[PDB]
Structure 1
Amino acid sequence: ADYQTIYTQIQARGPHITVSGEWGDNDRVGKPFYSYWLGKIGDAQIGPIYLGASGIAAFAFGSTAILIILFNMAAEVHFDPLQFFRQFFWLGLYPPKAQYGMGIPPLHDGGWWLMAGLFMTLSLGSWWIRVYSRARALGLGTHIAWNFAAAIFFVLCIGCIHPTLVGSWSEGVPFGIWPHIDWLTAFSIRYGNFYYCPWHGFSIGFAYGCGLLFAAHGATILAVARFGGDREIEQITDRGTAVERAALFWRWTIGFNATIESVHRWGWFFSLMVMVSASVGILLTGTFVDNWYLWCVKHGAAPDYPAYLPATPDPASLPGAPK
């Protein structure tokens, strides 16, 4: 085998490297340190990290968001430290349980939720800036930032935007380990089975496709590691055997092929798409589609099956059956 593809046989150590940006070179804190174990499967340098405004801001809003969550959770167990560690997964900060429509809800029934939500959005936004700006500073393109915005957007979608359209904060996503999860079910239940939402279907394809592609792209790269397949950049400006080989491998299997640059594009696009497709489907739910399954049946695509146990009529819809 090419053991290099599994872990690094002989680790190198050398002077630390610093590429300067139009700004903030003075905002890089830390004394870079090395880890030998990590060094086997990745670069061994941990650090330093750059601070700056946007970042520090992000830490700021974020943390606020957090105390808010933790505190309410903490209350959820009448401040018992031990039951706290214990029930953690079960604790959460909920959206308004009552219907207030769009009204800023009482602190107790959802008020603290919308605050958390706010600081988290502020926190996401600042971090976005960091991502975009550090790219700009080092003379790189905005691509990562543009994928990231798509993810921010989905989060916003399911947090503010969808609740804003239908007019009920009661639909946002609670905060907590199990709670954010039960939301999924409650959301799907209410809207008629998310499996029937075509955009859930689009998202899934992209997500699975994501899986398929990183697996294939990764593997393809290790498989040409020997020809320096890993130095992707120079393989673009100056095609080499590595990519030539990697191209024909895919050409001969599937009939077609990408380039070393284009594959990253298909990867980036797929990624972005997972999030874009999701936003569409959420924006369409409730606003224009009440029941996904029925909308599917409305339009003829749902499958149907025979009865196994006998067909069972809705007791309610019978004569003089109670309410």
Structure 2
Amino acid sequence: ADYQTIYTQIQARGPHITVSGEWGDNDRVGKPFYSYWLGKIGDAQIGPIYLGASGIAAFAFGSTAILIILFNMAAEVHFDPLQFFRQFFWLGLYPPKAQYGMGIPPLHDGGWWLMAGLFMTLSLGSWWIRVYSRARALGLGTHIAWNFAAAIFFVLCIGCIHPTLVGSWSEGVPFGIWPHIDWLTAFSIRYGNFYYCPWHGFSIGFAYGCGLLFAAHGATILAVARFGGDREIEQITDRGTAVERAALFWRWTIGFNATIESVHRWGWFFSLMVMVSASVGILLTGTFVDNWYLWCVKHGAAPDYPAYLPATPDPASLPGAPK
């Protein structure tokens, strides 16, 4: 019963360490403030917060996007603000319903959509710059920045690259809680079941793998919490007994093992591959596959099961059936 793995028993307040950026130490803002309940599962110290050009550029475009989305969402309930709160989840800003091709659609039919997307895209861009620049400033690998790039590329893939490659803004993801969800079913329906897209599968594999890996890694570091296993940077540069045992648990269980560093490579890679795999599938979808089921059938992948109720010919194709 290592309770320290569950919560910090005796917390320890102390004076706020500040590591110095190559630049922008003056752009750090706010007073640190400690917090007892938070400090029971985490670090008690909240703030300060760096607040760069990139960071502010993000809040700018982010809001302009949010405002566009929200003004449209109000208009859907002809501005009665009670119904706005009731109906929030159901409201949205849709792309074109009509087929304008790559033509810039009118504002009343998803031009406002297009607009908000531009600004959201700019927002993710400046925020990427933050995540990159801060690493370079504190003298750190740009690893986080790249994983995050993959993520951003996936968002571009679904929201504007794929639309472009098939040439219709109509295939964009709406803004809205339920409507961004409803997109997923209409998209999958259209492209012949996404379960039969192999890139979907790859994505899901890595996604479930991330579950498996963090569950396991987290659990491991906690199991060797008593021998300092959480101090990972030193267990890299000077292997301690924490990670000796951590490695031996896994070798004796599954036959092979990692190092305290390489497991983070494994994790980083798996994370990164959810977004990569996803992106590939979307790029191939519509452009070089119209129906993932029939493509699987074409290549002999799909299962078949026998009829339970009588098989049923399409009555459209019977002799002299209606339109």
Q: CA deviation at 1:126?
A: 0.3
- Structure-2 separation of matches of 1:81 and 1:108: 21
> Can you list the C-alpha shifts for 1:37-76, whole angstroms capped at 9, x where unaligned?
0000000000000001000000000000000000000000
> Can you list the C-alpha shifts for 1:66-95, whole angstroms capped at 9, x where unaligned?
000000000000000100000000000000
> Can you list the C-alpha shifts for 1:292-322, whole angstroms capped at 9, x where unaligned?
0000000000000000000000000000000
Q: CA deviation at 1:110?
A: 0.7
Q: CA deviation at 1:174?
A: 0.2
- Structure-2 separation of matches of 1:108 and 1:121: 21
Residue of structure 2 equivalent to 1:123:
123
- Structure-2 separation of matches of 1:52 and 1:276: 29
Q: CA deviation at 1:151?
A: 0.2
Residue of structure 1 equivalent to 2:109:
109
Q: CA deviation at 1:99?
A: 0.0
Could you list the runs of 5+ residues in structure 2 that have no partner in the other structure?
A: none
- Structure-1 separation of matches of 2:142 and 2:164: 30
Q: CA deviation at 1:197?
A: 0.2
3-state SS of 1:146 partner: helix
Q: CA deviation at 1:136?
A: 0.3
| Residue 243 (structure 1) aligned with residue 238 (structure 2) | no
- Structure-1 separation of matches of 2:282 and 2:270: 19
Q: CA deviation at 1:148?
A: 0.2
- Structure-2 separation of matches of 1:134 and 1:292: 42
- Structure-2 separation of matches of 1:125 and 1:7: 37
Q: CA deviation at 1:147?
A: 0.3
- Structure-2 separation of matches of 1:45 and 1:244: 32
- Structure-2 separation of matches of 1:122 and 1:301: 41
- Structure-2 separation of matches of 1:320 and 1:13: 84
Residue of structure 1 equivalent to 2:229:
229
3-state SS of 1:25 partner: coil
Residue of structure 1 equivalent to 2:57:
57
- Structure-1 separation of matches of 2:306 and 2:147: 45
When normalised by structure 1's length, the TM-score is 1.00
Residue of structure 1 equivalent to 2:156:
156
| Residue 7 (structure 1) aligned with residue 20 (structure 2) | no
> Can you list the C-alpha shifts for 1:101-122, whole angstroms capped at 9, x where unaligned?
0000000001000000000000
> Can you list the C-alpha shifts for 1:172-231, whole angstroms capped at 9, x where unaligned?
000000000000000000000000000000000000000000000000000000000000
Q: CA deviation at 1:154?
A: 0.1
- Structure-2 separation of matches of 1:318 and 1:174: 39
- Structure-2 separation of matches of 1:278 and 1:103: 27
- Structure-1 separation of matches of 2:186 and 2:157: 17
CA RMSD of aligned residues (A): 0.3
Q: CA deviation at 1:150?
A: 0.1
Residue of structure 2 equivalent to 1:259:
259
When normalised by structure 2's length, the TM-score is 1.00
> Can you list the C-alpha shifts for 1:120-162, whole angstroms capped at 9, x where unaligned?
0000000000000000000000000000000000000000100
3-state SS of 2:26 partner: helix
Number of matched residues? 323
Runs in 1 of length 4+ with deviation above 2 angstroms? none
Q: CA deviation at 1:252?
A: 0.1
Q: CA deviation at 1:235?
A: 0.3
- Structure-1 separation of matches of 2:58 and 2:136: 18
Q: CA deviation at 1:279?
A: 0.1
- Structure-2 separation of matches of 1:139 and 1:277: 30
- Structure-2 separation of matches of 1:21 and 1:36: 28
- Structure-2 separation of matches of 1:86 and 1:121: 29
3-state SS of 1:46 partner: coil
- Structure-2 separation of matches of 1:177 and 1:159: 16
Could you list the runs of 5+ residues in structure 1 that have no partner in the other structure?
A: none
- Structure-2 separation of matches of 1:77 and 1:257: 57
- Structure-1 separation of matches of 2:41 and 2:124: 30
